Design a protein around this ligand. Structure first.
Ligand SMILES: C[C@H](CCC(=O)NCCC[N+](C)(C)C[C@H](O)CS(=O)(=O)O)[C@H]1CC[C@H]2[C@@H]3[C@H](O)C[C@@H]4C[C@H](O)CC[C@]4(C)[C@H]3C[C@H](O)[C@]12C
Ligand SMILES: C[C@H](CCC(=O)NCCC[N+](C)(C)C[C@H](O)CS(=O)(=O)O)[C@H]1CC[C@H]2[C@@H]3[C@H](O)C[C@@H]4C[C@H](O)CC[C@]4(C)[C@H]3C[C@H](O)[C@]12C
Ligand SMILES: [Mg+2]
Lengths: 68, 51, 1340, 502
């Protein structure tokens, strides 16, 4: 479904800012999860440039500069 | 209010802050007094920066 | 014969059907309820007496003491209404109750007391209702709103085919008390009866019956019918009743007495049963297979062994019947059972039931109510006998018992307030019958299932809660140890009771601030039926079933007045004629219809009785005697409305307005509007701001006068007389001798209210409408309130509207207002603010209110007098200082270069921070009052002394004027008395006027009246002195302020808002709209005579919204102003009185078969010129709600004027000068001015004050806050490619604490660039996640 | 501890002095009032204000009116910077006092900083992407934000007290995104379907429908004109009616070449209204795009055709010109609405009497038991629905063509100039089901349970309903209101689930 596929995401902040926070946070804590900030809600919450519009060039540069 | 989301914690200001206007005036005063002290002799400028 | 307030200006009535019942007192509900509360009832059924008798007497815990109740008396208030609103305290009256303490003797249950003592104990204060129906709670006028809740009783409700896969309908019965535990029986998909208490885990239903001390045999006797089985040494005979046999299959030959009735393959029909009835069939032979399913009833114990052959409720088989056959048992009682008529529900419940005795059932009950603690023999019995069987913890009480007995079809109407065994058994039997098919379920929304609580009942409950508190306290104190020779002034604490009553009146959901910006707004706020509140449904747990108009709202609750929004249909408004029952239910009047004659006796039919009759319609023409015109008259029997014969009809509606409320019956031509637009018009009529000079409705409904008078705004006369002196602030009436009391020489004095603010900051101001030397009558209007014109509710002004599209300046819903409308000062209105400046006690010292303020010039301190406070009358604008105040400030510690500036230029640092009160940014108006309150130990400044001296002088003057007017009237009456019987023309004024009160007269009522008048004079002379002394003591005394505040200064500004683009203006028919331009006079479309229109509306708003009422109101206003212009032309040159009378009576005669004949033959040649001078601005017209002024009458009236009968004239353009094609519709539409002013809506913020935990801006316009850039706007910026605008919206502008100062300095510095950083709310979130046992970190 | 980490999970919540449960840490994070949705995804924002909105038709669709007071309060740092840059102030304190006194030299600075600086006008339920658009301010004397008429469809705004919040973009990239991405002239097509979103709405389509019509005998019928300029000079001089069938010589340009415009000239059988309107259409469009009655769909199609052929700049200029001329001729038409414009059919009472006789016949045949109660109910419903359809047909056929005027002869039919019919046919705020409740009958209403009442209400709003009919027709209105008041809560949650899955 829409809700069940939005709650099952690799990123856990884009799922914890969705409906249920206690369950998502407990599972992501026991699993030792790691959020790599690839979507739009993660970069909105953190307060940086969205990877979609005018920030796409910036995010491409930050990606290619990494490990190179 | 007669609802949620109107909690008393949303109405309390932060009185431990300075206005951005205060910061701008402090920076402007700092620059202006530096330029005024520049227009004096080096010895008197140092005596006024030490006093 | 017309009332003298109705001969000034007679409103032309267009209604055809006569009215037989007068509109009731509109505020009778609030006043009657609070009269039932504070009253002395000898029977003690309702009020304070019914709470005192409900709690007291209190008996100690075998301590041989008893505190008992005797009487009470409501004390007198210390401050009246105006003083309570000025000072800021509740208008309440002390409740002092007389109690009596008695101590008992040991080994004396009801023995003689040895020591008694009685006294009067003060138990809190109860707030009092004002003259109108509003409470004054803390200076503020509040209104307690009635509630519509579910009446106590028993309600059977189905599950209407939900919550199951197959679709079986489940039935459940609920017993709702007035106070206590909810008990609920419900079915199961397996037809097992289940019970549950307080909505907890369910139990099998027979558990409570076993708890009622029943065995299984007794239950089977209660719920079933016995079938007897017999044996004549063989063949197992069965006694048969003909009725039971139906619905079975006679696969065998059913025969009796050697006669065959049924054959093989023939099932039982009705004819076979009638054959059996005719042949008197009793006993039959039946095989073992026929009895192979029957159930034994009781236990059949064996003759010899005594062992249990078979216990209660176990099905008989071949072997068990064979076993009990030879044991000596020739009688077997079994249970009759079917599949559709009698059911096996109790039997299955018993087979599921685990409990076996009373104690086992009690333990099974105690294990759900108190899970976890071990059960006990005593504890379970205490719990169950205390659940539903103790008057302390269970009440129904009276309406509950009446509903309970009515629902079970019992005869008696009043009974005990607690349950009983037969009551629960009757509920179970009724539910089983509902399951079988006999009865039918109820509906909750039915207005015979919902009560109406009011102020009296809610206040009584809240008082009884406090009484229970004080009962616990007294019983704890009374029963301890001793006696102890103490009077009952210490066992009672007054605070737990007053705290409860103040918790109700002050902070409750139903104790609302009274909207006070209209007479209509007040009178429709007091008549409100809220469904929410304590004991009522939540706004979210309200379905779509309780938000629909039900067929039993006809006459009881308005259908088209409910607040659109999140609660539509939970805030209904009471109808016009509806009133509360004796029990609480709503009822509406109806005219009794005899065999053929519609009588005039008014019977109030409730919501349950009205369904049994056949009620006619109010649009049912009678032939001037009572008989209906046609035999087929539309009626409504029970919900559904159809056609019924004239002999069949039994009741008729009383009036044609009784369906609608008091706010939706002021809309002319309601019957043409849509229902949505009528709802919006009704809801927007109560927001109209009272303008500078309220005019009149040129098209009314006849309900304006009742609303204006029955509210509290206008000052109506109490006793008829002749006006002796009218001032702008008082009116003195000289009562006629017919209405005067024998004792006093009464001349009534009416004090008017001048410019006091309301709750909504508008202005309340009463002007006299009578003139010196003019008769008045009882109930006649003397002074007009806000939005009132000679006792008629005038909410707005009527202006020359036009319907055309005008260059797009009225595009969607906008309006285009001419400049004559703003020049003529007709939509301007006076708003009165109130600013307060409290001087407190800080730790570094007090705060002064001096007029010497640092860092402020003299151009700012020009308007402050020597004491600091501003003058009265000083026109202040935005930013001007009102009350100069300073605050002590220390620990300066200036940074470097600030010390340098100060050292170079001198001017040592200021040691007091200027925190004065200044006018808010934007408002600008005169100062009309300044009040100063001081604590009871602080020295008063010069200005407070000036105010005190002025108030003392004014109070002395007012008491002197009272005494002087009353004394003048008394001496004049004594002189008049001393003329009849002892005529002395000039012998009377010679002697001093003080010795007139001792002379004599002949033998009549006047000689034992001079003594009465002397007593009145002495009483007035003492009254003047006592009032002066008390008033001086009240003025001079200190005030009781908050702990820590030294003095308060309150400044009242008067702002006058004119009109501007943005101000919302609506009409009565739900056509709102925001003004969009203020055209010059020349640009407006002028008609053929040069008169421009004043407002240009839009035509496209009519066909898609279907409020066709406004077009007809426009035409009727055109006709009324045409009549007015004709009268004004005949008056402009002094014509005659003959022609004026002829034309006026010709205007009052149209049209077809109206009531209200106004023949001007008796008017006395000065009441015609006054009438024709009040009609020169347009003849007012009344168009009742559903009675209407039909189009033929409108066209006839338009023909009576010069105006064309179409309603549309040829209109020229103002700017081009060239004529508009397609003639346009002009008329006079009544425009309101709603209270959504543009200068209360607009605000802007560049940098203000930031919140505390999350460093973000605050809420709007009072903390100078920013606009919420919520989630959906974030998505709307992600949908574009705007990733930089979004980043500066959520980092630099809002939350990130260093980048916002850096960005401000960059913007001032000429460089538009942000160094963003990270928000602060994210750091708050990291701390709040990390402060669990969860480690979350930002790693790279 | 378990009441501190998450209060109320085990047992019952502990309560403070308020006798309310107090918030733990999990309640600080969870829910609509938690840090995740109230403070991180949505924020309160500086440099922003709101006010009521009005019309202001004189604007071009890339500018909005902004009050001087709002524009002085939002643009304060820019004003301080400019005052100290140009030398009118000693420092920023003196500049602050200068803008506080509202000196006469600060309005020139305000007009300087306002010039090319967009603002973001936003309406509160921002349902779709076109709910935030950026306009260029025009300083206005007042307190109402003036909003161009053509964007009211996009905002879903109407002027009955609705208010919009404006935001200021600070940095250079924010201004360039509000100019190159979010500007009002760059959003004229919907993002859900390719159809335009700035189509003219209600006054202008009525003016353009009134302009482009034809009546069978008007002033100046049959003249031959030398161009649209002569047609306009004929109309403004009072010598020809706005709709009179004439012959005009129009020169239309077609782009049949590989990017070139070819001028061709002919003689067309048109009116004066269409010839006047042809002065506004740009080059590349044909002439059969205005030679019609020009309802609302036709205007939307004309704008779409111009956008597909010519581009963006002529489409924006065309939209502004259409709005201006539509407002002008809607004003000059004087199209009003009176009580004689709601024509009852001449044969309504005959149809109602026939239906009542037939339903009485059905009742009398029911009382003999020949039909079941349900079959009788269904037959009654079908009879009344057929009667309602016949009344509606009679009304519409009496409304659309009852006008008849002669040309040098006896009589001739044409479409009607009835005001309500023009407002319904042109698409300007009306339909054929909103009418027939004004002139015809308004049919059968339903009860709360779902059943439609057997007897319908045979009265309309021209002649009013009685007490019982008006009370019957109130449940439908309350169900409509109680569905619009709680369908938004379902839609706003569906769209949030959709946004957070994608
Ligand atoms: C005697 C009088 C009617 C005369 C027969 C009966 C019938 C209905 C009774 C009221 C209602 O029950 C509601 C309420 C219940 C509270 O518990 C006690 C107060 C209330 C107001 C009751 C007082 C009184 O008892 C009433 C008026
Ligand atoms: C004419 C009328 C009596 C008719 C015989 C006289 C007798 C008493 C007079 C009033 C009192 O003096 C008190 C008061 C004095 C103020 O200064 C002016 C107003 C008041 C109300 C006076 C008006 C008027 O003059 C009164 C009613
Ligand atoms: Mg709106």
């Amino acid at each position: 479904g829409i809700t069940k596929a939005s709650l099952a995401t690799e990123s856990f902040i884009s799922a914890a800012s969705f409906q249920e926070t206690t369950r998502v946070l407990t599972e992501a804590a026991v699993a030792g999860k790691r959020d790599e900030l690839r979507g739009l809600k993660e970069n909105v919450i953190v307060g940086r440039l969205i990877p979609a519009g005018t920030g796409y060039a910036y995010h491409q540069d930050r990606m290619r500069r990494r490990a190179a | 209010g007669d609802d949620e989301d109107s909690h008393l914690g949303d109405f309390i200001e932060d009185t431990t802050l300075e206005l951005p206007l205060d910061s701008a005036t402090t920076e402007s005063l700092r620059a202006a007094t530096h330029d005024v002290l520049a227009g004096l002799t080096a010895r008197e400028a140092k005596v006024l920066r030490m006093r | 014969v017309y009332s003298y307030t109705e001969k000034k200006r007679i409103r032309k009535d267009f209604g055809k059907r006569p009215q037989v019942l007068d509109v009731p007192y509109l505020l009778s509900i609030q006043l009657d309820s609070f009269q039932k509360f504070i009253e002395q009832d000898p029977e003690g059924q309702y009020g304070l007496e019914a709470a005192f008798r409900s709690v007291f007497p209190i008996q100690s815990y075998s301590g041989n003491s008893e505190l008992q109740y005797v009487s009470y008396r409501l004390g007198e208030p210390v401050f009246d209404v105006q003083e309570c609103q000025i000072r800021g305290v509740t208008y309440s009256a002390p409740l002092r109750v007389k109690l009596r303490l008695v101590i008992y003797e040991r080994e004396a249950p009801e023995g003689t007391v040895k020591d008694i003592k009685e006294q009067e104990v003060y138990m809190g204060e109860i707030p009092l209702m004002t003259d109108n129906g509003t409470f004054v709670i803390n200076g503020t006028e509040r209104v307690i709103v009635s509630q519509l809740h579910r009446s106590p009783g028993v309600f059977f409700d189905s599950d209407k085919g939900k919550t199951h896969s197959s679709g079986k309908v489940l039935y459940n019965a609920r017993i709702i008390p007035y106070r206590g535990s909810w008990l609920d029986f419900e079915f199961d998909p397996k037809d097992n009866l289940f019970v549950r208490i307080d909505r907890r885990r369910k139990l099998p239903a027979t558990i409570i019956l076993r708890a009622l001390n029943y065995t299984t045999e007794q239950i089977l006797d209660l719920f079933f019918e016995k079938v007897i089985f017999e044996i004549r040494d063989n063949k197992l005979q069965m006694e048969l009743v003909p009725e039971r046999l139906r619905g079975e299959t006679a696969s065998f030959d059913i025969e009796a007495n050697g006669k065959v009735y049924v054959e093989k393959g023939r099932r039982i029909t009705a004819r076979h049963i009638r054959q059996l009835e005719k042949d008197d069939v009793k006993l039959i032979e039946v095989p073992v297979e026929y009895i192979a399913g029957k159930v034994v009833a009781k236990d059949y114990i064996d003759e010899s062994t005594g062992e249990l052959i078979c216990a209660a409720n176990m099905e008989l088989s071949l072997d068990l019947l064979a076993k009990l056959s030879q044991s000596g048992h020739k009688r077997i009682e079994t249970l009759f059972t079917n599949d559709l008529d009698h059911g096996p529900y109790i039997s299955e419940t018993l087979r599921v039931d685990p409990t076996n005795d009373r104690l086992s059932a009690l333990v099974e009950i105690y294990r759900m109510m108190r899970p976890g603690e071990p059960p006990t023999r005593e504890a379970a019995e205490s719990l169950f006998e205390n659940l539903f069987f103790s008057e302390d913890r269970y009440d129904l009480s009276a309406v509950g018992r009446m509903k309970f007995n009515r629902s079970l079809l019992r005869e008696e109407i009043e009974g005990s307030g607690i349950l009983s065994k037969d009551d629960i058994i009757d509920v179970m039997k009724k539910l089983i019958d509902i399951r079988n098919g006999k009865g039918e379920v109820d509906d909750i929304d039915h207005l015979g299932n919902r009560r109406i609580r009011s102020v009296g009942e809610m206040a009584e409950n809240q008082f009884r809660v406090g009484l229970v508190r004080v009962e616990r306290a007294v019983k704890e104190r009374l029963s301890l140890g001793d006696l102890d020779t103490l009077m009952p002034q210490d066992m009672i604490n007054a605070k737990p009771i007053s705290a409860a009553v103040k918790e109700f009146f002050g902070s409750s959901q139903l104790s609302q601030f009274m909207d006070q910006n209209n007479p209509l707004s007040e009178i429709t706020h007091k008549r409100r039926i809220s469904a929410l509140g304590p004991g009522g449904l939540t706004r979210e747990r309200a379905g779509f079933e309780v938000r629909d108009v039900h067929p039993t709202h006809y006459g009881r609750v308005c259908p088209i007045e409910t607040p659109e929004g999140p609660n539509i249909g939970l805030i209904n408004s009471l109808s016009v004629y509806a009133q509360t029952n004796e029990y609480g239910f709503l009822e509406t009047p109806y005219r009794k219809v005899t065999d053929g004659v519609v009588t005039d006796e008014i019977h109030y039919l409730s919501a349950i009785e009205e369904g049994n009759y056949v009620i006619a319609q109010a649009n049912s023409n009678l032939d001037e005697e009572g008989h209906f015109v046609e035999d087929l008259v539309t009626c409504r029997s029970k919900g559904e409305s159809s056609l019924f014969s004239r002999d069949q009809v039994d009741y008729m509606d009383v009036s044609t307005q009784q369906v609608v409320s008091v706010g939706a019956s002021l809309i002319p031509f309601l019957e043409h509007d849509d229902a949505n637009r009528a709802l919006m018009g009704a809801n927007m009529q109560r927001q109209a701001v009272p303008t500078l000079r309220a005019d009149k409705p040129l098209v009314g409904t006849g309900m304006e006068r009742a609303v204006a008078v029955d509210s509290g705004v206008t000052a109506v006369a109490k006793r008829g007389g002749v006006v002796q002196y009218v001032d702008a602030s008082r009116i003195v009436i000289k009562v006629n001798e017919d209405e005067m009391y024998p004792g006093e020489a009464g001349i009534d004095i009416y004090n008017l209210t001048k410019y006091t603010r309301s709750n909504q900051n508008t202005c309340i101001n009463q002007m006299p409408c009578v003139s010196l030397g003019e008769p008045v009558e009882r109930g006649d209007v003397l002074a007009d309130g806000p939005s009132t014109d000679l006792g008629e509710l005038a909410l707005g002004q009527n202006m020359r509207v036009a319907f055309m599209p005008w260059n797009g300046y009225n595009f969607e819903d906008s309006i285009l207002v001419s400049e004559r409308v703003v020049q003529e000062d007709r939509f301007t209105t006076i708003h009165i603010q109130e600013l307060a400046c409290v001087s407190r006690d800080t730790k570094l010292g007090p705060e002064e209110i001096t007029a010497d303020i640092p860092n402020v010039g003299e151009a700012a301190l020009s308007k402050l007098d020597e004491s600091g406070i501003v003058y009265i009358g000083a026109e202040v604008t935005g930013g001007d200082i009102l009350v100069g105040k300073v605050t002590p400030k220390g620990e300066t510690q200036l940074t470097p270069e600030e010390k340098l500036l100060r050292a170079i230029f001198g001017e040592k640092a200021s040691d007091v921070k200027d925190s004065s009160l200044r006018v808010p940014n934007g408002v600008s108006g005169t100062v009309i009052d300044v009040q100063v309150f001081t604590r009871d130990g602080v020295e008063k400044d010069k200005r407070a002394l000036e105010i005190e001296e002025m108030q003392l002088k004014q109070a002395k003057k007012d008491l002197s004027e009272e005494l002087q007017i009353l004394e003048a009237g008394l001496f004049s009456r004594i002189r008049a008395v001393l003329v009849a019987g002892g005529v002395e023309a000039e012998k009377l004024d010679k002697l001093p006027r003080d010795r007139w009160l001792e002379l004599g007269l002949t033998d009549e009522e006047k000689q034992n009246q001079l003594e009465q008048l002397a007593e009145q004079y002495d009483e007035l002379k003492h009254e003047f002195e006592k009032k002066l002394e008390a008033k001086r003591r009240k003025i001079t005394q200190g005030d009781d302020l908050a702990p820590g505040v030294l003095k308060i200064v309150k400044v009242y500004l008067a702002v006058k808002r004119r009109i501007q683009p943005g101000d919302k203006m609506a009409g009565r028919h739900g056509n709102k709209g925001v003004i969009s331009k203020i055209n010059p006079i020349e640009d407006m479309p002028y008609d053929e005579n040069g008169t421009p229109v004043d407002i240009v509306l839009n035509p496209l708003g009519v066909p898609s919204r279907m409020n066709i009422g406004q077009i007809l109101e426009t035409h009727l206003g055109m006709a009324a102003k045409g009549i007015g212009d004709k009268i004004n032309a005949m008056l402009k040159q002094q014509q005659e009185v003959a022609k004026l009378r002829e034309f006026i009576q010709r205007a009052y005669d149209l049209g077809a078969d109206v009531r209200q004949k106004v023949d001007l033959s008796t008017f006395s040649d000065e009441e015609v010129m006054r009438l024709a001078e009040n009609l020169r601005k347009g003849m007012p017209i009344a168009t009742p709600v559903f009675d209407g002024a039909k189009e033929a009458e409108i066209k006839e009236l338009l023909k009576l004027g010069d105006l064309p009968t179409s309603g549309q004239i040829r209109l020229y353009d103002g700017r081009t000068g060239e004529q508009f094609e397609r003639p346009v519709t002009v008329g006079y539409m009544y425009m309101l001015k709603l209270n959504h002013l543009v200068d209360d809506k607009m605000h802007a913020r560049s940098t203000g004050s930031y919140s505390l935990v999350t460093q973000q801006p605050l809420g709007g316009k009072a903390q100078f806050g920013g606009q919420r850039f919520g989630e959906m706007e974030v998505w709307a910026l992600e949908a574009y490619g705007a990733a930089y605008t979004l980043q500066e919206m959520l980092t630099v502008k809002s939350d990130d604490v260093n980048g916002r100062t850096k960005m401000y300095k960059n913007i001032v510095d000429g460089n538009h660039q942000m160094e963003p950083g990270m928000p602060e709310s994210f750091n708050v979130l990291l701390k709040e996640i990390r402060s669990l046992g969860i480690n979350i970190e930002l790693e790279d | 501890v378990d009441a501190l980490l998450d209060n109320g999970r085990r047992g019952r919540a502990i309560t403070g002095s308020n006798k309310r449960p107090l918030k733990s840490l999990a309640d600080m994070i969870k829910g609509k009032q938690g840090r995740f949705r109230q403070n991180l995804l949505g924020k309160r924002v500086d440099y922003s204000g709101r006010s009521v909105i009005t019309v202001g038709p004189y604007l071009r669709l890339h500018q909005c009116g902004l009050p001087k007071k709002m524009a002085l309060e939002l643009f304060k740092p820019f004003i301080y910077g400019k005052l100290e840059l140009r030398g009118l102030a000693t420092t920023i304190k003196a500049a602050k006092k200068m803008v506080e006194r509202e000196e006469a030299v600060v309005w020139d600075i305000l007009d300087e900083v306002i010039r090319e600086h967009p603002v973001l006008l936003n309406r509160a339920p921002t349902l779709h992407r076109l709910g935030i658009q950026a306009f260029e301010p025009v300083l206005i004397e007042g307190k109402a934000i003036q909003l161009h008429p053509l964007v009211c469809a996009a905002y879903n705004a109407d002027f009955d007290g609705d208010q919009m919040a404006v935001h200021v973009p600070l940095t250079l990239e924010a201004q360039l995104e509000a100019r190159a991405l979010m500007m009002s002239t760059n959003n004229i097509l919907s993002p859900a379907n390719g159809e335009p979103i700035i189509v003219p709405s209600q006054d202008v389509v009525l003016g353009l429908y009134y302009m482009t019509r034809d009546c069978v005998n008007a002033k100046g019928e049959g003249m031959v004109l030398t161009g649209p300029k002569e047609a306009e000079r004929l109309y403004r001089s009072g010598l020809a009616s706005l709709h009179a069938r004439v012959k005009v010589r129009i020169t239309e340009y077609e782009k049949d070449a590989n990017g070139e415009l070819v001028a061709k000239t002919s003689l067309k059988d048109t009116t004066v209204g269409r010839a006047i309107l042809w002065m506004i259409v740009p080059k590349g469009l044909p002439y059969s795009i205005v030679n019609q009655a020009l309802g609302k769909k036709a205007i939307s199609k004309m704008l779409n055709t111009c956008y597909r052929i010519l581009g963006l700049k002529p489409t924006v200029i065309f939209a502004d010109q259409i709005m201006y001329t539509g407002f002008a001729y809607a004003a000059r038409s004087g199209a009003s609405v009176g009580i004689d414009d709601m024509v009852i059919p001449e044969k309504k009472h005959e149809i109602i009497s026939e239906a009542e006789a037939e339903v009485a016949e059905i009742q009398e045949q029911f009382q003999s038991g020949l039909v079941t109660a349900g079959e009788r109910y269904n037959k009654v419903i079908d009879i009344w629905a057929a009667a309602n359809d016949r009344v509606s047909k009679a009304m519409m056929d009496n409304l659309q063509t009852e006008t008849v005027i002669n040309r040098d002869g006896q009589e001739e039919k044409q479409v009607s100039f009835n005001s309500i019919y023009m407002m319904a046919d042109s698409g300007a705020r009306g339909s054929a089901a909103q009418i027939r409740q004004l002139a015809g009958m308004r049919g059968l209403m339903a009860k709360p349970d779902g059943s439609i009442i057997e007897t319908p209400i045979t009265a309309n709003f021209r002649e009013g309903l009685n007490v019982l009919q008006y009370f019957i027709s109130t449940h439908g209105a309350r169900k409509g209101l109680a569905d619009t008041a709680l369908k938004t809560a379902n839609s706003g949650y569906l769209t949030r689930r959709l946004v957070d899955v994608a």
